[PDB]
Amino acid sequence: KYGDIFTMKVFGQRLTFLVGPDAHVPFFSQGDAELSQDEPYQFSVPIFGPNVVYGADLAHRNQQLKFIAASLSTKALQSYVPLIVKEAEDFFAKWDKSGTVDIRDALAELIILTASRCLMGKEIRENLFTEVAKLYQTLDEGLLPISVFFPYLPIPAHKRRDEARLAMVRMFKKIIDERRANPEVKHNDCLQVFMDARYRGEEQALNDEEITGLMIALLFAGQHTSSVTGSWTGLLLFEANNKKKFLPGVLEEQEEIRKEFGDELTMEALNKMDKLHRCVKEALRMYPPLLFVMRKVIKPFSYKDYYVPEGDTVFVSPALSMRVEEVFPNADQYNPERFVEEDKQAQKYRFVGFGAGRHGCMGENFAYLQIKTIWSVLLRNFDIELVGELPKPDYTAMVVGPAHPCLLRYTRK
Ligand code: HEM
Numbered sequence: 234k235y236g237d238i239f240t241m242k243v244f245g246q247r248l249t250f251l252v253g254p255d256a257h258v259p260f261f262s263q264g265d266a267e268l269s270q271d272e273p274y275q276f277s278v279p280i281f282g283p284n285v286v287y288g289a290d291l292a293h294r295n296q297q298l299k300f301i302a303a304s305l306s307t308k309a310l311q312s313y314v315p316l317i318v319k320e321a322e323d324f325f326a327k328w329d330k331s332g333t334v335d336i337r338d339a340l341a342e343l344i345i346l347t348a349s350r351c352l353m354g355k356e357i358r359e360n361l362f363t364e365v366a367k368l369y370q371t372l373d374e375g376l377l378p379i380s381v382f383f384p385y386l387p388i389p390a391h392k393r394r395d396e397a398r399l400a401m402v403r404m405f406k407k408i409i410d411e412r413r414a415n416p417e418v419k420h421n422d423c424l425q426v427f428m429d430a431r432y433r434g435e436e437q438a439l440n441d442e443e444i445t446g447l448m449i450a451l452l453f454a455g456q457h458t459s460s461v462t463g464s465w466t467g468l469l470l471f472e473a474n475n476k477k478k479f480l481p482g483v484l485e486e487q488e489e490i491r492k493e494f495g496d497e498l499t500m501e502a503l504n505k506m507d508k509l510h511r512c513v514k515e516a517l518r519m520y521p522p523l524l525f526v527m528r529k530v531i532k533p534f535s536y537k538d539y540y541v542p543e544g545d546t547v548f549v550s551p552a553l554s555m556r557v558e559e560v561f562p563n564a565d566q567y568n569p570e571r572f573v574e575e576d577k578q579a580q581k582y583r584f585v586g587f588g589a590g591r592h593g594c595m596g597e598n599f600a601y602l603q604i605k606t607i608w609s610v611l612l613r614n615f616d617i618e619l620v621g622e623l624p625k626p627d628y629t630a631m632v633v634g635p636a637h638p639c640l641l642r643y644t645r646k
């Protein structure tokens with residue numbers, strides 16, 4: 234090894250990792266001509282679709298990111314937040330006087346519910362959820378670690394996936410054709426943002442696949458990440474170790490705001506919950522949901538005295554580059570308040586769990602707001618104690634959340 238950087242050769246290709254905040258500089262800051270996403274992420278293509286995201290050429294690609302970006306902008310966010318909150322308050326109402334809950338599975342149910350209404354609209358969410366929660370998890374199920382190198386191996390799962398996507402397109406066929414018949418009616422969701430999107434040089438719009446694809450992707454990104462970091466934020470907090478040292482800090486801020494921005498719950502009020510923003514952010518720092526992020530190298534680049542040829546595949550791990558102790562004092566242990574003047578730091582790419590650069594996470598705030606809302610509600614309506622100790626990371630999966638007896642128990646407030 235070096236400490237900072239280390240290539241392997243595995244199967245065919247050779248994987249050049251980076252860990253340094255200096256290291257990251259080439260991974261997070263060169264451009265689309267210099268690093269490619271095409272090859273490394275090509276596993277997703279026939280989960281999302283043809284000419285969707287990584288499916289499409291560079292021209293049609295950069296624009297779809299933009300439609301997503303604008304679908305998830307501060308504007309559109311402010312308008313989802315109402316939906317996000319209500320669902321949260323609606324979900325946690327249903328709970329008992331007192332009882333156990335697998336916080337992973339519960340917040341997974343709850344985020345997909347809200348992922349439905351913001352991404353696919355009222356009709357999908359009100360009429361068709363249980364259908365579209367199957368048609369998703371059938372696409373999901375066609376993601377095996379084989380799929381990441383042969384994403385078209387004729388194996389039975391891939392068929393079922395390809396099949397389930399086709400079906401989901403025809404579902405939005407109906408819903409979009411309905412809407413294109415009454416332009417009159419205004420619409421608050423992503424798919425509307427997409428429906429109204431058009432490319433440069435052409436004014437026919439995106440179609441009932443391309444759209445559906447674009448939305449599924451955001452379904453994917455939601456379920457594979459928010460869902461877990463949601464759970465981590467709380468598993469860590471309500472471990473007793475940390476409940477003592479941090480939970481007063483927390484609930485004080487829950488009251489301090491409560492008496493200013495009311496019993497009801499609005500974005501203004503989330504945006505300034507600066508503690509819980511950190512108390513979540515630290516659960517990304519310690520247990521990022523994506524293990525690592527990849528590019529094939531196009532224009533080659535030296536790093537120090539280490540040459541990184543062409544056809545390489547440069548990695549960065551969140552989980553690795555955020556346990557560096559020359560960058561995070563006390564990295565082994567759960568310190569929400571580290572960010573209070575870490576966030577004051579100048580050097581780029583010290584925190585990478587939401588990546589950085591040209592391709593940093595277009596969902597960052599959506600995630601936060603979804604997540605903060607969940608605990609924001611859960612703190613006010615319950616008292617939350619952990620059963621067992623802090624769950625172990627679960628690498629036996631494509632998704633990388635906490636191991637599956639990862640539960641709490643609630644008693645009403
Ligand atoms: C805690 C939750 C999440 C985490 C940790 C996370 C993390 C990341 C990271 C690390 C990247 C960079 C990946 C790369 O370099 O290729 C990224 C990109 C992205 N994320 Fe997320 N993400 C989260 C949630 C979401 C959600 C909920 C959405 C959408 C609803 C979303 C949409 C995206 C998109 C569109 C990009 C691509 C930007 C591009 O390729 O130019 N993410 N995310």
Ligand SMILES: C[C@@H](c1nc(-c2ccc(C#N)cc2)cs1)[C@](O)(Cn1cncn1)c1cc(F)ccc1F
Binds near residue numbers: 453523524526596631
């Ligand atoms: C492109 C998507 C990514 N997949 C990985 C990845 C996952 C598992 C392995 C393995 N083995 C290797 C790489 C890193 S980034 C993703 O980056 C992921 N995402 C972003 N925010 C939330 N999840 C992605 C990007 C999108 F633009 C849309 C959907 C989507 F899942």
